[PDB]
Design an enzyme around this catalytic site. Sequence first.
Site, PDB file in Angstrom:
ATOM      1  N   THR A 142      39.483  49.212  41.230  1.00 26.60           N
ATOM      2  CA  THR A 142      38.023  49.241  41.188  1.00 26.60           C
ATOM      3  C   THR A 142      37.481  48.343  40.076  1.00 26.60           C
ATOM      4  O   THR A 142      36.429  47.716  40.239  1.00 26.60           O
ATOM      5  CB  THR A 142      37.490  50.670  41.027  1.00 26.60           C
ATOM      6  OG1 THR A 142      37.824  51.195  39.739  1.00 26.60           O
ATOM      7  CG2 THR A 142      38.050  51.580  42.114  1.00 26.60           C
ATOM      8  N   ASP A 143      38.174  48.277  38.933  1.00 27.55           N
ATOM      9  CA  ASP A 143      37.747  47.365  37.875  1.00 27.55           C
ATOM     10  C   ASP A 143      37.838  45.914  38.331  1.00 27.55           C
ATOM     11  O   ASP A 143      36.953  45.102  38.033  1.00 27.55           O
ATOM     12  CB  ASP A 143      38.582  47.575  36.611  1.00 27.55           C
ATOM     13  CG  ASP A 143      37.972  48.598  35.670  1.00 27.55           C
ATOM     14  OD1 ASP A 143      36.889  49.136  35.985  1.00 27.55           O
ATOM     15  OD2 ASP A 143      38.574  48.855  34.608  1.00 27.55           O
ATOM     16  N   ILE A 144      38.906  45.566  39.051  1.00 27.98           N
ATOM     17  CA  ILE A 144      39.021  44.209  39.574  1.00 27.98           C
ATOM     18  C   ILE A 144      37.853  43.914  40.503  1.00 27.98           C
ATOM     19  O   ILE A 144      37.226  42.851  40.423  1.00 27.98           O
ATOM     20  CB  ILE A 144      40.366  44.018  40.296  1.00 27.98           C
ATOM     21  CG1 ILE A 144      41.527  44.442  39.402  1.00 27.98           C
ATOM     22  CG2 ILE A 144      40.530  42.562  40.711  1.00 27.98           C
ATOM     23  CD1 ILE A 144      42.852  44.537  40.133  1.00 27.98           C
TER      24      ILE A 144
END
Lengths: 403, 403
Positions: free
Chosen positions: A169-171
Site C-alpha cells: 500500500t505504501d508503494i
Amino acid sequence: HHALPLAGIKVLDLSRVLAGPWATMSLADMGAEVWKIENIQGGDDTRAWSVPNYKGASTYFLCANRGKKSLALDLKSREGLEIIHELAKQADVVVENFRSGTVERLKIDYESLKALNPGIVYCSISGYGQTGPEAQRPGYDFVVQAESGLMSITGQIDGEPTRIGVAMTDIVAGMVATQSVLAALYQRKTTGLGQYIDVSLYECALNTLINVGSAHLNGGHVPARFGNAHPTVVPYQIFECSDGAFALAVGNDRQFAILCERIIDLPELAADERFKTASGRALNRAALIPPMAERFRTNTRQHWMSACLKMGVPAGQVKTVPEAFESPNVKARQVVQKLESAHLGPISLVRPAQGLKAQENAAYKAPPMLGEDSASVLGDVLGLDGNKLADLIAAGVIYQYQP
Amino acid sequence: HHALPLAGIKVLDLSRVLAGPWATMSLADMGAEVWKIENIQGGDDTRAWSVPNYKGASTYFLCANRGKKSLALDLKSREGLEIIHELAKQADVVVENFRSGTVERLKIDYESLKALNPGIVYCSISGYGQTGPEAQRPGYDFVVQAESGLMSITGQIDGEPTRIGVAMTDIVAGMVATQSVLAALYQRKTTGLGQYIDVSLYECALNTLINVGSAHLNGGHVPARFGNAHPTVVPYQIFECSDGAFALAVGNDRQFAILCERIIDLPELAADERFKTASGRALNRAALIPPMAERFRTNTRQHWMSACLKMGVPAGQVKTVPEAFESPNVKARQVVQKLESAHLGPISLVRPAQGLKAQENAAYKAPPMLGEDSASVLGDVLGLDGNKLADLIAAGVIYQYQP
C-alpha cells in the site's frame, strides 16, 4: 546523453520511510534533482532498520533512495529552518509525510512555503488524509492492509487473513503521489501556480480493491476468500501436479477449449454448456475444477507447462525472489542495475519501470550516505562559501559524511 | 467549475482487461477525454466477466472504466481502421495492451500512428516488455505474481505460496504507465514531440519487491516467509488476544517503550539492551515476541486497541471490505462516489486517490455501456453527419447502444 522528462525540476524531499521516498525516487528516475532533507540524528527512519544490512548499511533504505542527494540538517534549529526556506524558494516540488502537525510546528507547512514560492507543488502523504476524524491518526502500511480489507480477502480460504509480503500500500501511495505531482507540474506550465496535494494511504489501499470493491458497492455482493483462485476468472488458479504446483491462467474461451481438447484430454468439458463461456465457468466452478485437478496429478509440473507453452495456454510457475532475477528477460533487458557508491561500493537495484527510452542508458546516483551531499547541495544551490559551511558544522546545524 | 490538470488532453484508449484500462481511467480522473475503442463482439474482455454482476452488467468492468466514452468498432474492418487513424490525428495519447504483434497486424502500431501524428505519446503495456526472449509471451497478473517472487514470500510461514486477493501487479503497471504518459506529456510541452513507452508488467512486479529485493541484490540475503510478521520491523505483526487477533505496528523505539511500560506492563523488555533499538528487536526477535504474545492473550482485543489509542501506539484491526467502507473517514471525506448511468442507474465507485483539489467537486461520467458513446465521439471529434453514421451501422463497422 538522452534528456529525461523532468530535467530541471527541483524537489525538496522531506519524506521518510517508504511512501514518500518512493515518490521522490520516481521523480528522480524521470529526471528530477532531489534534495533529501534528513534529520542529523539517524536521518531517514529506514537507516535504523539495519536487519538485513549490506556492509553495515540498511538494505531497506537502498530500495527507495536511488538518485537522491542527502543533506543532513537540524530541522528544529534556527539555521536549519533558514536553509529549508532558501531551498524552498528554489524548489519546484515539496514532498512530506511527517506525522500530523509536524510541518505546522516546524514552519515548513504549505502556507509558509507558498508565500516564499507560489509556484511550489506541495504533496503531503498521510495515513488517512488531512481532514476528517482520523486525520491525526498515524498511517502504517501494515495497519492499512488490515483495515482496508486487503487482508480479509488474502490467504487460504479457511486460513486467517494474511498480509502481503511487502508494504504494497505504501508503494501504491507513492506511485499515486508521483502522478499527482506530475499532473500539477503539467498544469503549472499554463497557470504558473503550484497547489497542495492530499494523498491518503487508506484511500490508495481502497482503490486497490478494484473488482472486489466494485462488486460490493454495486449489488452489495459480500466478498469471499478464494485462496489461490480468482473470484471471477475460471480456471485461473494453482493446480497440484505429481511433483508440485503450477499456476494456470486461461483468459478467454478459446484457450480453455485448447486446454481441454489438446493438453489435459478432457474434451467433454469444452463441449459442456456450463463450461463453454467464462461467465458459465465461474457459476459452475464447483463442477469444473475437481475433474481438472484429478487430471493434473497424473503428470509432472514440467509436462503440463511444456504442453501449455506449445498449445498457447498461459501458465506459469511459482518462483523464489532469487529465481525471478535469473529469468531470461531480467538478463536480456538488464533489469538489475549496478550503481557505484563512494563508500559502499557497487549497489544493485531494480531499474525504474516507467519504460521511457531516456531511462535505458541513464546513469543513476547510488543511494546516499547520511549527509553525503550536504556541502554539495548548500554550495551549488545556495552558494554558501567554505567558511559558512564550517560554521554550520561546528554549531551542529549540518552534518557531512566523512570517510 | 475547478479545472483539472489534463483538460484538453485526448486519449485513444485501445486497452482492455485491467492494467491499461486503469491507466486511462486515471488520465480521465485527472481531466483527460478518453475514447475507449472496443471490439463490437463483446468489447472489453471484462464485459464478459459477468460473475458477479449488477443489473446484469459486469461489476469487474465498472471498477476501471469511469470517465470513458465507449465507441464500439470493428478494428479489422476497412472503415474501422480509417476511424482509428482519423482519431489518432486528433489524439494526444495512445494506450494499448494487445497481445504481441496485434497492433502491427492491425496497422495501429506506433510507427504507423507516428506518421499521422508526430506528437502522439504512445504507451504499450506488455507482460514482459517489447524486447527480449519473452516479449511474445502473454502477461497475466496471476502468472506474474507467481514468477515475480511475490507469492513465494506471501502467506503463512509453513503454508504454501499465496497470491494477493486482487490483481495488484496490473494495478501497479497501470499506475506506472500513468506516470510515464504524464512525464512524456510534460516533456512534449518543450520538445513538441511524442515518444514510445514500453511498460513491463513483470518489471513493475519486481519493483514492488522493494526491501526484500534490495536485500537479495545487496548481500545475497535469501528471502524468508514471515507470515503476518515483517522481516525487518519488530514488533510489527498480528497478535492473538483472548477473543481475536489485532495488528500491532510500532515504528520507533519510543513507541515500543510506551507499549512495554504503559500498556502490556512488561517494563523489563524496554530496559533490555536486546530490545531497546529496532535493529536489536529484529535480531532478538525470537526472545521478544513470545512474552508479548502471552501478555496479549490475557485481555480482549478492544482492551488492547483502546490502550494503544490512549498511549499513542499504532494499532489496527482486520476489517472486511464492507467494514472498511463504513470507516469514519470514508463517510467524512466522501470516498465512495455516486455516478449516474443512463442504463444502469446509480453506480458507486471508490473516488480517485490523486488528492488534487479539483477532483473533489468534479463530476465523473459513469462507466459506459458498450457503444454508449459511438455516435457522440464520431460526431463531435470527426464531424461525421447523421447520414454517414447510418451507413456505418448498416455495414457493421460501428455499434451504438440502444435502450
